């Protein structure tokens, strides 16, 4: 029975649970990598080694946080648990293929940990640029194991995207139009379209890198008439959509959390929220070369990418203002989830605005490949994507488990993490403006004060992560069973109880025209 249920699952809830467990474990690996980074940077001079072991750690940190923590939690975990419940569907369209999306991830992760154990690791950056990632400067198996890790993660997500799009289009109640689905459902549909279009281009690019490394192709090798810059275009054609894939499900969760803890039946400006997410998804495909402002492209190309990138602020601002307008007049419940969501709105806005600074190619000359970029993306990832994950986790934990968290412990957790992430990343703006480069194991002495404070921040965040484990233990240890949940009339995922039965919507919902 255990094998049938947990290795042979065709159940969206159990598969969601497997993704959440996987993502939680991946988060601990990513946190340990982040602490090794900050342990090295927290004092001038070399602690670990030369830049190779340091950049193996940096590279692994990014791949783990992105591919093994954020995507599996948001899409595999919250998506599998919530999407079918929010549309009244009895499962996913392809419930057996769903299981293979999950089981491809442990092998993908094993290939990444193999990459770090063999030879000297893949010290490439998560971008894996050639020629450093090629067979001369990174001879041996490490980069090939990294490429194969990404192939398995990519197939996982492509099949997951096919599953989500089909489920959301095809398995709603017949009276329910797309304009009567909850915003989280829209956020997953749009994320899935981005995955479907972007990951195959990554797959093509890393396959070319594999053949350059092993079959004597020269896509990226000037000796054969190749171009390292071609790899960058193919990578970033995926990579910019990838960051929208990381945030969009977060935007969907924030819309549900702000609505719920405002005591509202509905988010402000539903159709504007739908418009905003589709506009962000679309614009996310036409901006990739803002990652390449220093490579030597033509001025008119730089002018276009500056302008197109800045345009994303308009739909994004509609979402931020619509969240504020959802709070407006609310009966505010100061739940731990609400605290995560309010932290998100502010800290995501700050990171989005430093992105607008970077979109300016003239200023990006000085900021590119500095800690200013690192500050930007950690505000949107470590304070945006992560805050949406923590808000959704504490909000929906009672649905998934049938047990309550200790709200006082959860508020303590939030307070510690808020201090730690801000202490970690705020000073990195100063390091960037003053010229500290990325991917350095060591820095000139002038940069010591801000690196010291940043590292102290990272230790506060570690304390928060350890406390979160304890808080989940205390909930399962105490077994406070859920009795009543407010606002079920506008939150269908709660209406089958906590936890919902294995099979829900065996008899579908009745919705007339």
């Amino acid at each position: 029975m255990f094998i049938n249920r947990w290795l042979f699952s065709t159940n969206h809830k159990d598969i969601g649970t497997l993704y959440l467990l996987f993502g939680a474990w991946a988060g601990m690996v990513g946190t340990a990598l982040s602490l090794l980074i900050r342990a090295e940077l927290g004092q001038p001079g070399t602690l670990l080694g030369d830049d190779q072991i340091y950049n193996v750690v940096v590279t692994a940190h990014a791949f783990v946080m992105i591919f093994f923590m954020v995507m599996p939690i948001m899409i595999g975990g919250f998506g599998n648990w919530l999407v079918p419940l929010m549309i009244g569907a009895p499962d996913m369209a392809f419930p057996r293929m769903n299981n293979m999306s999950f089981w491809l991830l442990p092998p993908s992760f094993l290939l990444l940990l193999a990459s770090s154990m063999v030879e000297a690791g893949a010290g490439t950056g998560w971008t894996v640029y050639p020629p450093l990632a090629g067979n001369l400067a990174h001879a041996g198996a490490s980069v090939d194991l990294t490429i194969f890790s990404l192939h398995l993660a990519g197939v996982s997500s492509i099949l997951g995207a096919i599953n989500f799009i089909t489920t959301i289009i095809n398995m709603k109640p017949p009276a329910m139009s797309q304009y009567q689905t909850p915003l989280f459902v829209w956020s997953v549909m749009i994320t899935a379209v981005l995955l479907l279009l972007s990951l195959p281009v990554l797959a093509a690019g890393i396959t070319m890198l594999l053949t350059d490394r092993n079959l004597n192709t020269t896509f990226f090798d000037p000796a054969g008439g190749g171009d390292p810059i071609l790899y960058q275009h193919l990578f970033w054609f995926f990579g910019h959509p990838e960051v929208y894939i990381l945030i969009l499900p977060g935007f969907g969760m924030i819309s549900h959390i702000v609505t719920y803890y405002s005591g509202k039946k509905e988010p402000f400006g539903y159709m504007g929220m739908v418009w905003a997410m589709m506009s962000i998804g679309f614009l996310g495909f036409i901006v990739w070369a803002h990652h390449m402002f220093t490579v030597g492209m033509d001025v008119d190309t730089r002018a276009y990418f500056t302008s197109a990138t800045m345009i994303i602020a308009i739909p994004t601002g509609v979402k931020v203002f619509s969240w504020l307008a959802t709070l407006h007049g609310g009966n505010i419940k100061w739940s731990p989830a609400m605290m995560w969501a309010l932290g998100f709105i502010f800290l995501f806005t700050v990171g989005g605005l430093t992105g607008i600074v970077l979109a300016n190619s003239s200023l990006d000359i000085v900021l590119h490949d500095t800690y200013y970029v690192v500050a930007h993306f950690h505000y949107v990832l470590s304070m945006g994507a992560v805050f949406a994950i923590m808000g959704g986790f504490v909000h929906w934990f009672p649905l998934f488990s049938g047990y309550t968290l200790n709200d006082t412990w959860a508020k303590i957790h939030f307070a510690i993490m808020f201090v730690g992430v801000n202490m970690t990343f705020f000073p990195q703006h100063f390091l960037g403006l003053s010229g500290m480069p990325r991917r350095y194991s060591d820095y000139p002495d002038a940069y010591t004060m801000w690196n010291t404070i940043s590292s102290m921040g990272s230790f506060i965040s570690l304390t928060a992560v350890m406390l979160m484990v304890f808080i989940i233990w205390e909930a399962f240890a105490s077994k406070r069973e859920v009795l009543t949940v407010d606002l079920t009339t506008t939150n269908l995922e709660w209406l089958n109880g906590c936890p919902p039965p294995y099979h829900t919507f065996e008899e579908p919902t009745y919705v007339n025209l």
Partner: protein, 258 residues
Amino acid sequence: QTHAYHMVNPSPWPLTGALSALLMTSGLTMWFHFNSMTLLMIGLTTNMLTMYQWWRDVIRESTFQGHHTPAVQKGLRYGMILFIISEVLFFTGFFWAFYHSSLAPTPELGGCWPPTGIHPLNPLEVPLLNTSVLLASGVSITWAHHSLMEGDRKHMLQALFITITLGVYFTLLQASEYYEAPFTISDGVYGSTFFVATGFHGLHVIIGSTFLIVCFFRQLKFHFTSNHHFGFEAAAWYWHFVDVVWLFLYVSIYWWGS
């Protein structure tokens, strides 16, 4: 249940497929770096076993058990369209590589396309024949589809046999052209773009031909009705995709790139 959707029996094939992916990738690593094909041959074997049993079970669920209601069939239609879109974007990456290299040939090539020392195939010889073969196979598969909708078992089988024969002819012609080609995958970015783009296309022709052969044997076994035959529709869509990719390769690499 009082909905029309398919609750699938708990299945081992997702796990066996995921492990086959680990064995194929760790196997390619072992082949490229440790001079051994053992893991790779285990992974290919487990991958083929997994595909066989998974798709066998889909036939059991549909033809034998009746789980493919119109709602389920509509889901599968969306699934196959979305899969084809993902494969189009995969080929787009290779076309991008090709245009990037060919539109701005570097000094190492002689600053020209084709590069100095490359003698392209004549696009009017076997590549034109290959074009006529895949276009003809798009006509014969359409005949097969109409025969099936009109309830004509013999003409469906004849038209599908012709379609498969043409797919095999294309594959044998391409194999011969590979052997005869005076340039190789190691002949710079010309050989790189030529063999990786046409090689992934050739793989898709083999996959599509295999799918058509599965449809041929299912038809021989009377699985398809005149109205319910999604496996055949999916194979035909995939086959048209393979045709269209070829036409883009022919115009881009063989003709405009010569």
